[PDB]
Design brief:
The structure is a homodimer.
Chain A: E1 10-13, E2 17-24, E3 29-36, E4 42-45, E5 65-74, E6 79-90, E7 98-110, E8 121-124, H1 140-147, E9 154-158, H2 167-172, E10 176-180, E11 188-196, E12 204-205, E13 207-212, E14 215-216, E15 229-231, E16 238-241, H3 242-255, H4 263-266, E17 272-274, E18 287-292, E19 298-304, H5 306-309, E20 310-313, E21 322-326, E22 328-331, E23 335-337, H6 339-342, E24 345-350, E25 355-361, E26 373-379
Bound molecules: the ligand CCCN(CCC)C(=O)c1cc(C)cc(C(=O)N[C@@H](Cc2cc(F)cc(F)c2)[C@H](O)[C@H]2CN(Cc3ccccc3)CCN2)c1 (2 copies).
C-alpha cells in the first residue's frame, strides 16, 4: 500500500514530458528517460545531438550485446532511427532489480529530442503488438516482469505545477511518481474506478459519453473512439478525432462566450494571458469523459477542469501575467488522453487484470470552487457499440 | 551561339575545380584562376608554393598599386592570408576589356592550393556582402560592370567528362565555358527556367520540394534551405543539411537496394568500381530539386542523374574498371549545389534581374535511357515559408 522508495521519482512537465532516471550498461551509465505509455520501444540517444549533454556509449559497456539489426520508429510527430542491442538496465528509484532488456541506440533523429527537457531516451510502456520492428522485440516492462517477481502493474501520478516552471525550477521540482509493481494510497483521494483495456496494444479504452459542463456533446459514441482511444503520457494534449474536436470546441466556446479569444488560441498555437491571479477559471467549463466500467451496462466518469486543459506557459515578455495555451487538439488517429488529462488523476495500468484505474490525484490543480472527480456508477447501454472496428 | 570567343574557355574537373585564364599587371602576367560562385574575393598566389609553378609578381607590374592592408579568408575548408592591392586585369578568352580590380596577393595558405589543379588563384564571383575584410572591397565582377559596358550577367557551363582524365588529358581537354556578359544558346537544349536570387550575398536560392526517383522526400521545405541554399562552383559535391542528407541517403539506398555498398561509399570517402562499361546506372535514382519560380505559386524542377552525383575517379590500381565516389555530402552550413550538380546544367547568373536560370547542359553526361532535365511549371504554395530566417 506504500512504496516510499518510488514516490516522487519523476520530474518534468506536460509540455516536455515526464521522465524517470535509469541506468544502462556496466559500469552503469545514468540517463533520464521519458515515461511513455503511448509506445513500446525502449530507446536512448547513442550519439551526439545538440539537445543532449549525455548519451549511451555502447563501447563503454561490458554487458552490451549487439543484435546487428536496425530499427526505425516514426511517432505521431517525431521519429528516430537506431541500432538494436541488449544490456543490463536498472531504475535507481524503482524496484531493487536489474533486467536485461532490448535497447534501441538512437543514431539519427528528427524532432524527437526536446531542447531543455533533460531526458535522453524514451521508455515505451505499451504492448509488444506495437513495438518496432515487430512484436518479437520484447518491451521493457515485459522483460521486467518475466525476469523478476515484480507484479505486472505500474501506476502514474503526473503532477502539473499549475504555473510555469523555469529552467532551474523544473530541474529541481518533483514532477510526480511512477510506482512500479503497485499502488501507493498516498497519491490519490477517493475511490479508484476501472475501465477495461479493450485490447493489449496501446492502452486502449472506450469512451461512452462526453459532457461539457454537464451538457451532453450528443454524438454517436463510436465517434469518440474513432479509430481508437488511448491513455498516453507521451503526448501533451487531449487529442480528439476531427468531428469530436469540432463539436467540443464549439461547446467550450459557447460556455466561455463572455470572453472572446483569437482563432490561434483555439488552434492550440497561441497563448492567452491575464493579469496575475485573475485567470477567469469559472467562465471555462469542466469536461467529463465517461468510460466503460468493469460491470455490464455500467460506466463511470472522470471530470477535468480548465486547470487541466489550459496549459501554463511563460509569457513572451516574461511578464507577471498568468498565461496558457489551449491543450486540446484535433487528431486523425483517434482520441489521445494525454499528459494534461493524466495530471488530474492517479492512473493505474493494471496489466495483470487488463484494466486501467483512475482516481482523483492528490496533486491535481484546482480552485476553491471546483475539483477534478472520478465518479460512478452510471447505467449505460450497448457500450461495446462505442468501440470502433 | 553568339559568344564564340568565350565558348570552351574553361578547363579542369569537379574534384579540382574549373578555371579560366586571366592576366594581371603590366606587362600582363598569365595565371589560371578558379571560377568560384561561392565566394567574393579575387586572390592569386603571390609567393612560391610547392603546388604552384607560377605566381603574381607585383614588383614586375608597373600598374600595381599597394593598398597597404592585409586580408585573411577562411573558406568552408582551406584558408589563405594575403596583401591587398589593385592592378589591371583581363580575360584572354573573355570580353575584350581591361579593368582595374582589387587583388589579394596570397603570401601564406593552408590546404588551399591543390596539387595538379593547374590553377594559381581564385575568382570569387558572388556579392560584396561576403567579401573579406568587408563589403567595401569591391568584387571583380562589380568592377568589371562598373568600368565597362559588359552586361551584369555571366553564365557557366561546367563539363564533366563522365570518366577519369589523367594529368595530360585534363590539361588538354575543354572543361566548359564561362560566358561573361551574356547567354550562349549553343550551350544548352530545351528552355531556361529562372529561380529568384533570394538575397545578394551568396547566390542564394530556395528549394521547395525534393524527389528521389519521383518519390517525395517529404520534409518541411524549410529543412532543405537550413540555413541557406546556394549555387557554388567552388565546391565539388552537392552538400545537404544534416537531416536532409540522412533522409536522402536513406532513400537513395532504398532505390539502389539491389546492390549493397559499404558505409565508406555513402560517406563519400571510398570509391566503388565496376568492370569496364558495366556501371549499373539504372539502379541509381534520379534526384529532382524543385526551385521557386518567378511567378507566384509556381515552381520548376531540375533533375540530375547518377552520372552527375557519382564522380568518376581513377582506380587505386589504375585498372580498367570504371570507378566513382558518391558526390553528395552532409553540410552544417546549408545546401550547396556544387560542381557535380552544375555539370548537368547551363547556369545563368542573371545579376541584372536578380535571378538564376537553369537549362539542360549540351555537355551533361547521360545514357540512352535517361537524361538530365529542367521542367515546369508546377503549382507550389507558400514557397516563401521554405526560406530560413535566423
Ligand atoms: C511536440 C513534441 C512532443 N510532444 C510534447 C512532449 C510530450 C507532444 O505533445 C506530442 C504531440 C503529438 C502530435 C504527437 C506526439 C507523439 O507522437 N508522442 C509519442 C511519444 C513522443 C514523445 C516526445 F516527447 C517526442 C516524440 F517524438 C515522441 C507517443 O508514443 C505517441 C506515438 N504514436 C505513434 C506510434 C504508434 C505505435 C508505436 C509507436 C508510435 C501513438 C500514440 N503515442 C507527442
Ligand atoms: C577539398 C578541396 C576543395 N574542394 C575540391 C575542389 C573544388 C571541395 O570540393 C570543397 C569542399 C568543402 C567541404 C569546402 C570547399 C570550399 O570551402 N570551397 C570554397 C572555394 C574553395 C575552392 C578550393 F578549390 C579550395 C578552397 F580552399 C576553397 C567556396 O568559396 C565556399 C566557401 N564557403 C565559406 C565562405 C563564406 C563567405 C566568404 C568566403 C568563404 C562558402 C561556400 N563557398 C570546397
Amino acid at each position: 500500500g506504500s512504496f516510499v522508495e518510488m514516490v516522487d521519482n519523476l520530474r518534468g512537465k506536460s509540455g516536455q514530458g515526464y521522465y524517470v532516471e535509469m541506468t544502462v550498461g556496466s559500469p552503469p551509465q545514468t540517463l533520464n528517460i521519458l515515461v511513455d505509455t503511448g509506445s513500446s520501444n525502449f530507446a536512448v540517444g547513442a550519439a551526439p545531438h545538440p539537445f543532449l549533454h549525455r548519451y549511451y556509449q555502447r563501447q563503454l559497456s561490458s554487458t552490451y550485446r549487439d543484435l546487428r539489426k536496425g530499427v526505425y520508429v516514426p511517432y505521431t510527430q517525431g521519429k528516430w532511427e537506431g541500432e538494436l542491442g541488449t544490456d543490463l538496465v536498472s531504475i535507481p528509484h524503482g524496484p531493487n532489480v536489474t533486467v536485461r532488456a532490448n535497447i534501441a541506440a538512437i543514431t539519427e533523429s528528427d524532432k524527437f529530442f526536446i531542447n531543455g527537457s533533460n531526458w535522453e531516451g524514451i521508455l515505451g510502456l505499451a504492448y509488444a503488438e506495437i513495438a518496432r520492428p515487430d512484436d518479437s522485440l520484447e518491451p521493457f516492462f515485459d522483460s521486467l516482469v518475466k525476469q523478476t517477481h515484480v507484479p505486472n502493474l505500474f501506476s502514474l501520478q503526473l503532477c502539473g505545477a499549475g504555473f510555469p516552471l523555469n529552467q532551474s525550477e523544473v530541474l529541481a521540482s518533483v514532477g510526480g511518481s511512477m510506482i512500479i509493481g503497485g499502488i501507493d494510497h498516498s497519491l490519490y483521494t477517493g475511490s479508484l474506478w476501472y475501465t477495461p483495456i479493450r485490447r493489449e496494444w496501446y492502452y486502449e479504452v472506450i469512451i461512452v459519453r462526453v459532457e461539457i459542463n454537464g451538457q451532453d456533446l450528443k454524438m454517436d459514441c463510436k465517434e469518440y473512439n474513432y479509430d481508437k482511444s488511448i491513455v498516453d503520457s507521451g503526448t501533451t494534449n487531449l487529442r480528439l478525432p476531427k468531428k469530436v474536436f469540432e463539436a467540443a470546441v464549439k461547446s467550450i466556446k459557447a460556455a466561455s462566450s463572455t470572453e472572446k479569444f483569437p482563432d490561434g488560441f483555439w488552434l492550440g498555437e497561441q497563448l492567452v494571458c491575464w493579469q496575475a491571479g485573475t485567470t477567469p477559471w469559472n467562465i471555462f467549463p469542466v469536461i467529463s469523459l465517461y468510460l466503460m466500467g468493469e460491470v455490464t451496462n455500467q460506466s463511470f466518469r472522470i471530470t477535468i477542469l480548465p486547470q487541466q486543459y489550459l496549459r501554463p506557459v511563460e509569457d513572451v515578455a516574461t511578464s507577471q501575467d498568468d498565461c496558457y495555451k489551449f491543450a486540446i487538439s484535433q487528431s486523425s488517429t483517434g482520441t489521445v488522453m494525454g499528459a494534461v488529462i493524466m495530471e488530474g488523476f492517479y492512473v493505474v495500468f493494471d496489466r495483470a487484470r487488463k484494466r486501467i484505474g483512475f482516481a482523483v490525484s492528490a496533486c491535481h490543480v484546482h480552485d476553491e470552487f471546483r475539483t477534478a472527480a472520478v465518479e460512478g456508477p452510471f447505467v449505460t447501454l450497448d457500450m461495446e457499440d462505442c468501440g470502433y472496428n
